[PDB]
Amino acid sequence: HHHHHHMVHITLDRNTANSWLIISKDRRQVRMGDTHQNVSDNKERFSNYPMVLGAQRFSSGKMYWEVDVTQKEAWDLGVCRDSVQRKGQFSLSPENGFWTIWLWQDSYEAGTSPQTTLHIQVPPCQIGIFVDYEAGVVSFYNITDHGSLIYTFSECVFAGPLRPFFNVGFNYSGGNAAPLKLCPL
Numbered sequence: 620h621h622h623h624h625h626m627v628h629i630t631l632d633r634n635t636a637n638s639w640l641i642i643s644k645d646r647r648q649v650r651m652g653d654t655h656q657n658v659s660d661n662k663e664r665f666s667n668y669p670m671v672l673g674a675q676r677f678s679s680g681k682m683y684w685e686v687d688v689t690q691k692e693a694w695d696l697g698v699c700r701d702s703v704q705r706k707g708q709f710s711l712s713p714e715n716g717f718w719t720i721w722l723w724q725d726s727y728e729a730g731t732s733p734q735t736t737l738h739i740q741v742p743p744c745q746i747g748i749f750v751d752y753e754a755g756v757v758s759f760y761n762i763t764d765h766g767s768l769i770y771t772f773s774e775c776v777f778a779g780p781l782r783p784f785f786n787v788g789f790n791y792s793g794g795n796a797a798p799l800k801l802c803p804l
């Protein structure tokens with residue numbers, strides 16, 4: 620792909636984070652803590668899952684960023700509506716305002732309803748995410764495999780401002796403590 624020139628500098632929004640997340644001082648890295656991180660509750664925080672939003676809101680244009688997923692067993696990545704549900708149980712789908720892919724139990728899947736199997740020969744250490752607001756497109760790229768396409772959501776109905784979306788996943792196994800990191804431009 621040739622989307623690199625639409626690179627944007629994403630930072631994480633502490634106020635949206637699940638209360639067990641630890642965000643670095645530079646707001647570029649997030650990981651699961653072993654306990655509640657001693658923050659007050661608020662209506663923005665994701666309650667049920669280890670999720671956080673980027674601070675940036677997008678309503679036009681073309682945007683590209685990259686996320687490091689090295690040595691994680693489970694994670695979700697993509698974009699979502701600013702108005703997504705924060706509290707309680709929900710599935711990641713375009714109907715609920717999410718355009719995402721994930722790793723879970725040694726398989727990669729796109730967050731359609733129902734979910735779609737992905738075909739990845741080279742497990743990615745870094746993921747590129749491309750959003751074309753006007754075209755209604757969200758695409759995912761395998762940076763470890765020379766930028767090969769993972770998945771394209773097309774005919775997207777964004778229906779609002781978009782935010783970068785992250786889920787570091789639970790760490791029941793003791794093998795998923797590693798962070799998500801926003802990679803430098």
Ligand SMILES: CC(=O)N1CCN(c2ccc(Cl)cc2)CC1
Nearest residue numbers: 650688689690691795796797798
């Ligand atoms: C609990 C803690 O402080 N940890 C564990 C997770 N860590 C980590 C960083 C990068 C990568 Cl690739 C893998 C794992 C940092 C140190």
